[PDB]
Amino acid sequence: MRSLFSDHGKYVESFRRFLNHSTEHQCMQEFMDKKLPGIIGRIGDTKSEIKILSIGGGAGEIDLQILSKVQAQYPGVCINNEVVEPSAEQIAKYKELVAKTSNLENVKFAWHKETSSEYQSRMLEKKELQKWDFIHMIQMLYYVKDIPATLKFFHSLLGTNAKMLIIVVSGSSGWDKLWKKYGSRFPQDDLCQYITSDDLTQMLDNLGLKYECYDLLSTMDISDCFIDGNENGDLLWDFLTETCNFNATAPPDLRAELGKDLQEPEFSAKKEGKVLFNNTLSFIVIEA
């Protein structure tokens, strides 16, 4: 039983089934349209340049939505958007997207193929720390080894009136229930750990930082998960379990258990002839 984190194989294909089967994207887009404006309201006050740091930037969809809200709030102001991302593949697509968008003149990008850790250490070696007006870590803390040091570090880079935004699954989502109850019966991949908003808020309370946490409901249609032999439903099985071919490798005593739970009022809600795994997201805003 190997971790789906296999890398650029079943991972990607399973991920895709996750996107085209959940409101993951719409959920974040809804937050950027209704809450982001208020949040970035003063990050550029008194400045002739706005510095934005994207950790785990990814492909850039949401990144681009963020810039747009920042731009309408600060017409004419140059923006400097740096991106910290380890995967060349992700960087390639991010670049492609930029070259197709046309409202990006006052915006200059720079991409760095490295991890947030390499960034952290490599920046602790130079001179004094460069400050940022806005930093964001969207769905990537799962891949960080030392979360506390990471949160203390990046918070120390926040300039005057600056804000840091972080997004992970909610402590009240199905994932939370899925990991607590079956977390150890799933392949241990030291490349990623389980993290919910509960864990994050406790680490933030302990670090003594001031934050605000908003939850927003999202779902993942796992209807194909109850249709024996459904090849797509099997795909979702791999993403959830973080295991390749979960259906054909997992103890008959394991899956048999999951079936009953992936339907309970804690894991998923049922309606319209559908089963919707709870994908609630958390948006934490950390003040400088």
Ligand X SMILES: Cc1nc(N)nc(N)c1-c1ccc(Cl)c(Cl)c1
Question: Which residues here bind ligand X, judged by CB under 6 A?
Answer: 24, 139, 142, 169, 175, 192, 194, 242
8/100 with CB nearer ligand 4DI: 8
Min CB(173)–ligand 4DI separation in Å: 18
Q: Which amino acid is at 224?
A: D
Work out which of 22, 32, 82, 86 binds ligand 4DI, going by CB under 6 A. Answer: 86
| Binding segment toward ligand 4DI, per CB under 6 A, in 31-39, 97-105, 140-148, 204-212 | 140-148
**Contact indicator for 268, 223 with CB cutoff of 8 Å:** no
Q: Does 4 bind ligand 4DI (CB under 6 A)?
A: no
What part of residues 171-190 is at the interface with ligand 4DI (CB under 6 A)? none
Interface with ligand 4DI by CB under 6 A: which range of 122-130, 139-147, 200-208, 238-246? 139-147
What does 182 bind: ligand X, ligand 4DI, none (CB cut-off 5 to 8 Å by kind)? none
Residues 141-170 that bind ligand 4DI (CB under 6 A): 143-144
The H-or-E segment that residue 124 falls in is: helix 116-125
CA distance 82 to 161: 19
Beta strands in the chain (DSSP E): 49-55, 78-84, 107-112, 132-138, 158-169, 211-216, 219-221, 268-271, 274-278, 281-287
Confirm or deny that 279 is annotated as ligand binding. yes
For residue 49, the cross-strand partners are 78
State which of residues 140, 164, 236, 262 lies at the interface with ligand 4DI (CB under 6 A).
Answer: 140
91 is in an annotated binding site: no
Going residue by residue from 52 to 81, which x/- string records binding to ligand 4DI, judged by CB under 6 A? Answer: ---xx-------------------------
Cβ-based nearer residue to ligand 4DI, 84 or 158 = 84
In the complex, residue closest to ligand X by CB: 142
What residues have CB less than 8 Å from 50, skipping those under 6 apart? Answer: 43, 44, 70, 74, 77, 78, 79, 80, 133, 134
Nearer to ligand 4DI, 52 or 275 (CB): 52
155 Cβ contact list (under 8 Å, min separation 6): 164, 207, 209, 286, 288
Q: How far is the CB of 136 from ligand 4DI (least distance, A)?
A: 12
Report the alpha-carbon distance of residue 247 to residue 270 in Å, rounded.
22
The answer to whether 195 touches 168, Cβ cutoff 8 Å, is yes
Query: At 233, is the secondary structure helix, strand, or coil?
Result: helix
* Sign of the four-CA dihedral 262, 266, 268, 272: positive
Report how far apart, in Å, the C-alpha atoms of 24 and of each of 32, 33, 281 are. Answer: 13, 15, 8
**Residue whose CB is less far from ligand 4DI, 59 or 275:** 59
| Feature table: binding site | 24, 56, 85, 90, 116, 138, 279
Residues of this chain that bind ligand 4DI (CB under 6 A) = 55-56, 84, 86, 115-116, 140, 143-144
| Feature table: binding site for S-adenosyl-L-methionine | 56, 85, 90, 116, 138
| Feature table: binding site for substrate | 24, 279
